[PDB]
Amino acid sequence: QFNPYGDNGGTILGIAGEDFAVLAGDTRNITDYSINSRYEPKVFDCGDNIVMSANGFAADGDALVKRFKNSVKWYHFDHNDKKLSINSAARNIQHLLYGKRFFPYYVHTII
Amino acid sequence: GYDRALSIFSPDGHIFQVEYALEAVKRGTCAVGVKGKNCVVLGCERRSTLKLQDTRITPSKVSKIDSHVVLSFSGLNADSRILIEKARVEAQSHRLTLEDPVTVEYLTRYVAGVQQRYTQSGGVRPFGVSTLIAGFDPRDDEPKLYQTEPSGIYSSWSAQTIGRNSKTVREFLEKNYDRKEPPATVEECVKLTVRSLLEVVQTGAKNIEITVVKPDSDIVALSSEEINQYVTQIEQEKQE
Amino acid sequence: GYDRHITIFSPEGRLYQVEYAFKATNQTNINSLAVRGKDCTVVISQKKVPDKLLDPTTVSYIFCISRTIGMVVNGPIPDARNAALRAKAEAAEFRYKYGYDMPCDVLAKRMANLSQIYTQRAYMRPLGVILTFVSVDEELGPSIYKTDPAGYYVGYKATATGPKQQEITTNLENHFKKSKIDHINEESWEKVVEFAITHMIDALGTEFSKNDLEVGVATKDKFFTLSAENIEERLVAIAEQ
Amino acid sequence: MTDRYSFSLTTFSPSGKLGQIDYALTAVKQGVTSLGIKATNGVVIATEKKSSSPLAMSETLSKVSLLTPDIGAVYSGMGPDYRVLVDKSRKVAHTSYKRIYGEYPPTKLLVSEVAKIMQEATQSGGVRPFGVSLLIAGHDEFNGFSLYQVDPSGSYFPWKATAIGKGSVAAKTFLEKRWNDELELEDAIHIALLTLKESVEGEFNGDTIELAIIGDENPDLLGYTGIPTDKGPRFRKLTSQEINDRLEAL
Amino acid sequence: MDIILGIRVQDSVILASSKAVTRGISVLKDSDDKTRQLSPHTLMSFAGEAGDTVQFAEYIQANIQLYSIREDYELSPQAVSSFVRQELAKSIRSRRPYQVNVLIGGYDKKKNKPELYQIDYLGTKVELPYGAHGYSGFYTFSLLDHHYRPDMTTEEGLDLLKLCVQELEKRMPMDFKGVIVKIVDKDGIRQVDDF
Amino acid sequence: TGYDLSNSVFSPDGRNFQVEYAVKAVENGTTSIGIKCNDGVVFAVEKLITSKLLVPQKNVKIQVVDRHIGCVYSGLIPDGRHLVNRGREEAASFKKLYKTPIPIPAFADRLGQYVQAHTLYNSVRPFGVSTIFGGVDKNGAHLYMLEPSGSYWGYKGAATGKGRQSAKAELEKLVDHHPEGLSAREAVKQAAKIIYLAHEDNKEKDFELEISWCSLSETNGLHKFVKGDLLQEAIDFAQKEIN
Amino acid sequence: GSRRYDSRTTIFSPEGRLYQVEYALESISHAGTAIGIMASDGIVLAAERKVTSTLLEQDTSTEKLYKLNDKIAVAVAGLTADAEILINTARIHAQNYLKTYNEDIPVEILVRRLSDIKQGYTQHGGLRPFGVSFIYAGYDDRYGYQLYTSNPSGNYTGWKAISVGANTSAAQTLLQMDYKDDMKVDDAIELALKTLSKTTDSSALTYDRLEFATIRKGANDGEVYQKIFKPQEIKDILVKTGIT
Amino acid sequence: NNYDGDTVTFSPTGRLFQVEYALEAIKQGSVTVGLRSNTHAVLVALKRNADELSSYQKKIIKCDEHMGLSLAGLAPDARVLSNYLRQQCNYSSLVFNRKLAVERAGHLLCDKAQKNTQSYGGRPYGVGLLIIGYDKSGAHLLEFQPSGNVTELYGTAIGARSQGAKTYLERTLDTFIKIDGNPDELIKAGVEAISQSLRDESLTVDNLSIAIVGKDTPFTIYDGEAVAKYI
Amino acid sequence: DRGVSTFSPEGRLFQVEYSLEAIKLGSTAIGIATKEGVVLGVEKRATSPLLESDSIEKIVEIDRHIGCAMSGLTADARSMIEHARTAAVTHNLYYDEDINVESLTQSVCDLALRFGELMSRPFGVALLIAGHDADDGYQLFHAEPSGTFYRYNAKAIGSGSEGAQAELLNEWHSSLTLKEAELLVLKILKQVMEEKLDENNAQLSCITKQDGFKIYDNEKTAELIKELKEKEAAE
After folding, report:
1. Per CATH, domain I1-235 is 3.50.50.60
2. Where are the alpha helices (DSSP H) in H41-200?
3. Three-state SS at G207
4. How far is E63 from chain B (nearest CA, A)?
5. Are I55 and B14 a contacting pair at CB < 8 A?
6. Could you confirm whether domain E1-195 is CATH 3.40.50.300?
């Protein structure tokens, strides 16, 4: 039977200071016991001072990140170049993920 | 599906189909509603070019929407059945989901909304009906009376009349209804309601219907005899 | 009178759009003719190529609908091709569904039913064409069946269509009065084609070169059109007579 | 594209006539005369095969059509309208009856179905009425022999005998004189041929006359033997020869 | 859900219905009324799949109330029972069927007779002198087969019910937290407050 | 009357006046031509220079369909684009199912039937273009012209637009003076001449020339535009002939 | 586009009337008169056929009176074809109610739904109304014997006696004159025919130009029978009242 | 006259009047100008207020980082067409990772407008657009008209009295075409061009609107105090 | 006839222009924007003394930070308000924030031209949409059935509007206090109204950042009306 998911490995890490935040992730991408790439970044600048990583199944992670980047683009178009606050970004991403509640994005997401 | 925009604007900014729907209402038999201190009375003219009627089975002009709300109307009768059905269904649906019967304002607003919708949907003409909607909100003793019309505008009335010669009876109610002091009893309110119809009707024979609505789903139809008493007493007082 | 613009009845019970579609039938100013042999069915139509800039080979009003059925159209070419494509599709589908070659008369009926719909349903206009279907049917033998914008159809011993149709019709009627039979009592399609051309010449009172004509022949198990060279051979054979 | 004519093309005029039904009937008036006569042991329906050119083969044009093995139809008005009605009438006898009850519909009910189709063309969006009147003759076990007329409005009436089209007024009068409730099938055929000669101008013979009967069962026309309770169609189109035979003794 | 009984005596229908609502190893509630009044002289008890039961009951209630208003007239118990059967008979072949069993106890005022209808989730209707749904019937039917008489008073019917509840409290594995009893007669629907 | 207000209505003479009115919009457009040659076809069109502000070479009007078909049209420009977009869908579909690229006669009927379909109903308007198109298939070269009625035939040469008659005359001479054939490079020059000659009927504004071609030998059977040395060479040949 | 040819069947006049309903009623006014009379012990339906020809098959025919179910019948005035469409709808709708509730449909409920269908054709869909007026005669155990009329507007009303079609003005005055509440069926039969006799546009009333039906309690105790009179039976009832 | 009832009707001379009337709404619109060098392309737009209490209707809409337009006519129609364009630029990015060619943007607008000119019940768009963009083949200016006709130009103007600016640009061609690598000078040439179309009014701070895109400048809009620099 | 989506030869949509006439017949509505808030006032215009005037709802809440007043065929406004509320609440659900007043207005204005042969005709009502947001402060918008919306410092719509607008042209300055604005709206309403202004036949409302959108009671407006007469009597 066809299995629509995979596991691309890696791990990510976010910490918040008083006037800064960091989002770190390794650049290794794997399937099973093989390395696909030693440098494939999965932590992205999404505009509006939001960084995002969606770790797990890379195809799903890239799709989500791609969609969120797009969400920011349209948020500017539809709301007079307003800055997307991190709290509003968080809520927007909940709806992106939950919209696929019955066929999920297999990713742990941090922004 | 049949698509045509029948309700459309004319160069003067009038929607003729809505306005012609009002002409149909003007041609309808008169209906009046008056709210007392503690009740609301709905009165309806029944046109008297018709003997050999069977009144047991002929559609009564006041309709119960729920056990606490009633609706009367002037205009096309077949049109009014459609509105009455929808309102009844909405009444039951509101009880199902809110676990409370409709307020009179809510039920009015719904019916008004249906009417408005038929003024800017393709393939349909507006309802040739204006309604009076009356009753008491659940667990409330304050009486309610609203009016709707083909355009979909609705509002509250201390008393109001619709249909043919409604201008005459509105005229009457306007000089005979004190805001400061509404008909203190059922007796009083029914009387003012009959008097107003008698400016327009004929004899108050098989010509006037009266329905009284009190709080807590207390709604009764008056019959010939008791109406006749009102007709009788009104005229004998009038010989001055 | 909007009753003259769509296919609804006029007060005298008439469909003007159908009547005006018949008038479009002659717009091309071409005459066609069909006859039956013992073995074959021949259809000839005039070929008029006015402009010199045209590619004469692409100018045709005869269509090969199926291996066995041919169709000549009297009317404007866009409607003609519209009818040709549909008939080809209908003949192919029939074979697929029922496991045998669609007969000439049945295709005629089917296209006639299609035309009838346009006379009853308002959104569809009639096609300004008359469709002459020819074949050697496996049950009925040589066959000619003709369809018009009214949705009418019938089989013929022989027929003609176009502006000077009546001349050709009476020419043929007079032959069958004399011959006493249903067909051209001839062995080869070549001689039946020769007959067809000969009686077209008499009725029209005109002479044809190889490029003034267009010929379709239906035999058992194939319908085919002749090249100019095949027609020239036929014209020559008539002249040496 | 798409049929954007979703509204009625037949509507009431201020006088209350439905114009298109009226004009359809006028189209039927222009049509060639056809008739039907109901005998005690059969029904006859007849009409003229008015050919378009002598080069046409008028056998290939059937004005009288089998609908079921015991029901036949004939018409006056527009031929192509009749052709598609016969197509639809045949199919409806199966879809809405035979495929349900395992037997062919009784005459009145099939007639009822055809009328429905014709009524709908009088009220549905974007169509004109059918420009024909039908005479439907048929037999069924519980109702016996019957004959119906169906008009463009979708109205139908049972008839002892009647005629429609061109010379109907004259033909109906000739039938009132001759019809009685004791007629045998052969007598009705004879009357039919007589009534029809009035309206035909040119040739009058077995090749210009189309005529079928609803009569006795025809086992010779069934196609198979071995089921004795199956006895074959009651509908029979009389041959060119058969008609001429009756014109010598006219 | 679980226990619902009905007994039709001379002049009334008595419906008894358990008060417990259990999920997992927790009795979430011990005072649940597993009943909807469809019309003034018709009552419906219900038991089955969580959620479906109340959803179905209230849906029927809404429809019967709508009918009452439209015609200003009360449907007979027989008519309501047939309406309810049809809805269940529909549902059993839906994408997700209502898994609800019901008893409909009504007093028919035209006939002046009480009536008891047992309808399961498949849409199987039967009119009965006494009925039950679920495991209850395995004890009560035989008990009633013995003790029940056709001409019993409402008061005798209530005692016959105490027998039924007593037996179920003795032999049933689960604690169903007693029953709410409701009587349907010529004067409508009332609830026995101490049982 | 009022027979001309709604598309697909037959007039009493048997005509569809809306289609005839669409032709008027075609006749109003700039001139375009097609010349069939030995192993190919050449298309050319007059592009009016409305203003200095038009970027030269940068408002291309000839359109390729698939890899082997060229289309040019006179009339309402967007209507021509709609028709070519449809032609492209039709060619894609044919290719998808039958593998081989669409034969030109087959392609011509696909446009023909589609255009003709827009004369069948009053809910659509007929196409406001006459389209010259063609190319090279397994059977050789083909040139077609298609009109708002859906009518089309194969041509030795074809023209449409304001200069249609001037160009027709010029095309008739070529057909008459070259019975054996005209070569592709030859036809590219003549095309340029005929456009310059047919520009007399349109002469307030000066114009930009645009040629394209498919030739089995010269373009490998593919549709390519003519630019650079070969275009200028053909422009010059035309410049010569008007003086 | 097609807007050109749209009659706009469902619009108001400036006087607030529905043209197509008005004109449908005008159509109906030329149809054979149909009469309904309701008594304490039954109902009469009587209707006049549009001018028969002698060759019409009179017994296998039904043009005016139709059976909706065992307890309900209708008299038709207008287009027959239109009426059959509505009748089959009404027949189905009665069967749905029986299937749903296991009780025969109350007369008004059937009447209301047919009237509601008619109403729809006047408010939406751009189609012509049904050119039909019905007289409904039927019995149910709530209201007993009932008469109703519906017309193309979808308006319905109840009656003791009523006519539809041709000459209703004349017929209605005659009924109003001689009808009394305590009347019996056989008196009602007599009134029905005598009214048609005086209002008919024919020379005189004969059996062949009539359809006739009663709904009595005439069978075995508290149960109802519909009687669609055969030709011979009308002939007798015509003699038995002295009209022939 | 008898032939202007709808877009599906040709006149006897072959004209489409509903399209021509749609074209007329552009003519009543406030003036806007487009022009470009080899490195940048600029939009200048005169904005129109309802009265002294009202804001000045925006005329410039951003489509992507490398493309945008100015409008003249029905504003909501420009919103629809600009939104369609945003989607097309977006599809090109997400699917092909490719910035949408300004020329293709032109073709797509042409084909969208055209369908409303051939079908019953619709209506032509009532707005004209000037599209600037910097893509893989340099700076571009496009003129869209709701007939469907899209044209690539060095410069142009549309709206009321656009003819003044259009002749100025027609004169100034050889100068402004070579304002390479200087944003402020190309803008000045644009503001100067629009000024030829002013009557009984001149450019104010909240009246004027400029947009620029080019080699290393994302499509951006200047209004308010940010245009004072150019009055 | 002739299609609902037709252009006039002047290049305007007939149906949109005709709806603009219907709006001119509507009762007066006035809005004024200050740094302290936005005021919205309307003429109730009861068509008879028997009608209970507090049932005339022509000023309406959309969200806590956005209010709306209407003029024209006011039954046509119900679904516009319904859409507006849904859009505002939906925005808050998707983004955990208040929707911008401009964005809300743009969303309502998208409905406008979705009519033809979608709804059958344009709306016959204009809206004054007033509110506050962090980015652009206190705002007033005039939303027409053309789909066009304009921002205004102050605006009047309905029958009294050309007179009222000319008055607002003089009286508006960038430093109006909220109280000054309230009085202005009352003043200008009393001017253009047929019948004599009072607390029963006119209605006031405002939206402040601090307390959001509030409709004023008849008691509160009565005091403002009294106060307005005293300030005019005194010069």
Report:
1. no
2. 75-96, 102-115, 162-176, 183-195
3. helix
4. 8
5. no
6. no
